[PDB]
């Protein structure tokens, strides 16, 4: 069979099923069994078989539009998607990655590869807005799909397409990377609201690869160097330790191998 498929829809609004979903994702992203201070580390990209390297997240609308997303199980980041018979991939910034993404949606008809990557500061352009100004929650997630599905048909502009990218990633990838950011989405939902992310989050997003590094190279959990994030008040502050982050960060990109 093909890569695993974790199914989710914005029709049934249950704020539980959202959670059961993010936990389905995390369950596929790693096996656990490697955990640094109770925080699971994603599988090491080195030696990892391509048949094991991707995950598929399918997403349904209330307009009943289905779009399948591909994530890299090493970074939990979206490498591309599939809507209808057309498949679109982010730019594979290295040779080895280029090879691997060709194992995705092999049976799709039209395979596109963008000239751009999937990193924020890049999409923050095409969208024309910024993460700070871009709306999230279950609201943008219905429209983020109707964008992607309708991109294959040229019915969605690129600006709103990169905008639709920025919504997806944060609400899947980052949600699964952080318990904190995961919880933040349920909130916008249970009361059915929609809004933009606070510095608490953004600083977490920019810092995820940073923290993973800091945590795994830490001496007994103590960061060799501090790291500055922000809270909703915008106030900056530093983390000297893995402790605080346990309720916050869920998965870590493999950085090093475990100590004694």
């Amino acid at each position, epitope marked *: 069979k093909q890569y695993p498929i974790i199914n989710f829809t914005t029709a049934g609004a249950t704020v539980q099923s959202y959670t059961n979903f993010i936990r389905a994702v995390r369950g596929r992203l790693t096996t656990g069994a490697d955990v640094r201070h109770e925080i699971p580390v994603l599988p090491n990209r080195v030696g990892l078989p391509i048949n094991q390297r991707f995950i598929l997240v399918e997403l349904s609308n209330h307009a009943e539009l289905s779009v399948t997303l591909a994530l890299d199980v090493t970074n939990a980041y979206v490498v591309g998607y599939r809507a209808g018979n057309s498949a679109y991939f982010f730019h594979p910034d290295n040779q080895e990655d280029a090879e691997a993404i060709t194992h995705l949606f092999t049976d799709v008809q039209n*395979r*596109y*590869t*963008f*000239a751009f990557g999937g990193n924020y500061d890049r999409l923050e352009q095409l969208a024309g807005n910024l993460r700070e100004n871009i709306e999230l929650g279950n609201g943008p997630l219905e429209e983020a799909i109707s964008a992607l599905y309708y991109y294959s048909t040229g019915g969605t502009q690129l600006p709103t397409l990169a905008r639709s990218f920025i919504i997806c990633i944060q609400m899947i990838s980052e949600a699964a990377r952080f318990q904190y950011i995961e919880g933040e989405m349920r909130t916008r939902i249970r009361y059915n609201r929609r809004s933009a992310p606070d510095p608490s989050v953004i600083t977490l997003e920019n810092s995820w690869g940073r923290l993973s590094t800091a945590i795994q190279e830490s001496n007994q959990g103590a960061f060799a160097s501090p790291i500055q994030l922000q809270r909703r008040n915008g106030s900056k502050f530093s983390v000297y330790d893995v402790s605080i982050l346990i309720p916050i960060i869920a998965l870590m990109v493999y950085r090093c191998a475990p100590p004694p």
Partner: nanobody
Amino acid sequence: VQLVETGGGTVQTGGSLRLSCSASGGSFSRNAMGWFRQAPGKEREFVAAINWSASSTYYRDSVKGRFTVSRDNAKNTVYLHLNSLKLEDTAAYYCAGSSVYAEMPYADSVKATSYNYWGQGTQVTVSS
């Protein structure tokens, strides 16, 4: 990104010439490039296309195994090598990249609609 084309001019039946297009700035080398041509009073034709890598090349049926398209992302130029020139090939040759896609399905690669930026169209004529 802006394109400039080189080569092109008087050639004789069965000869060779090499067209090149140098891109200064922009996303080039993350971009798919393609070559198109038109003779006067004749239809616009797809000639060749090449992706970013570039591991995928497509050629107009009539030119298959005659023309070869190349690129150097380090030199920021894309090459169209024209060998064994038939009279059929007399035309102005245009090079066009797409800043949106590093690669395209070839349904899109064959159409000039899919490319958002062009060169100035160096002229090519084949005598005999």
